Design a protein around this ligand. Sequence first.
Ligand SMILES: N[C@@H](CCCC[NH3+])C(=O)O
Ligand SMILES: [Ca+2]
Ligand SMILES: [Ca+2]
Ligand SMILES: [Ca+2]
Ligand SMILES: [Ca+2]
Ligand SMILES: [Zn+2]
Length: 316
Amino acid sequence: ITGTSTVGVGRGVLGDQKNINTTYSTYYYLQDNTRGDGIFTYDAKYRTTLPGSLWADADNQFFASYDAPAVDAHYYAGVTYDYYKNVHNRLSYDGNNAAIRSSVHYSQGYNNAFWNGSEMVYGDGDGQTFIPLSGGIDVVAHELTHAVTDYTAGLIYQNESGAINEAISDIFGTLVEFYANKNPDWEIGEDVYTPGISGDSLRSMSDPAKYGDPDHYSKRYTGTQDNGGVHINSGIINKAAYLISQGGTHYGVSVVGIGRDKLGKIFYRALTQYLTPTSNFSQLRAAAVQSATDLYGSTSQEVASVKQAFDAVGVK
Ligand SMILES: N[C@@H](CCCC[NH3+])C(=O)O
Ligand SMILES: [Ca+2]
Ligand SMILES: [Ca+2]
Ligand SMILES: [Ca+2]
Ligand SMILES: [Ca+2]
Ligand SMILES: [Zn+2]
């Protein structure tokens, strides 16, 4: 909508106060004009018609319980935009400052979040498996990263290409979490998963097997569930990315860590220059090796570590 840019204040899902960029025209709307062609947050009103209504508020204060998922979806979309712009020189998900749209309060008891081809969508959770999923910066950045992938490599959401697609979203979700630097880790969704259980998460990149996901290609799932295991076999790539950044010895293979920033540069270049819709894990290895070669040189430690990491997870 047309209006003047304003700064509201509210509380997110976890009770933390933050400022939000809003737009004033009779009401104050969750429309951030400071980033690209805007970040817009919508109320789906417990239904499944999308996007719903652009979030409107009478006083620019967002402290009601119902406001909290919208505050975080809006704010963390901004963080994610900033990460891609500041770190990778990428303007929104399409590289041309496309408007970023999110809807919250999707359906009832909805234990998930997704990118629907056009926008991000967040359930509130059922209060036991999840609380409202926009409370997780890694979840928000995971979903927006699907938009990036969809515009760039276009990895088909099935089998190995789909597991790469998922791992890319977990990788950049995690790198965005570190960029914001609140309580960062290599786990996925810990801030919104199982409020009654401390210390767990939906997936682990440092130890995928903690939640039954494979950490080596020999353990890959080959059935048909979950689009051929896209959220399962992502563990193999997540583990490789974790090893590239942090190092370690995994099934006897030692990897020299090179840190998160270089992990991000290598995988962003692979995503945007080398991967294609049909890429498999072997092709991801080659794309990552080539990306590291481009950035750091063929004789670099960075290239050697990429090779070590894919060796360690059984990807040749
Ligand atoms: N996002 C993953 C895990 C969440 C499961 C919650 N229902 C999936 O859709 O499979
Ligand atoms: Ca208000
Ligand atoms: Ca965390
Ligand atoms: Ca996390
Ligand atoms: Ca928990
Ligand atoms: Zn995903």
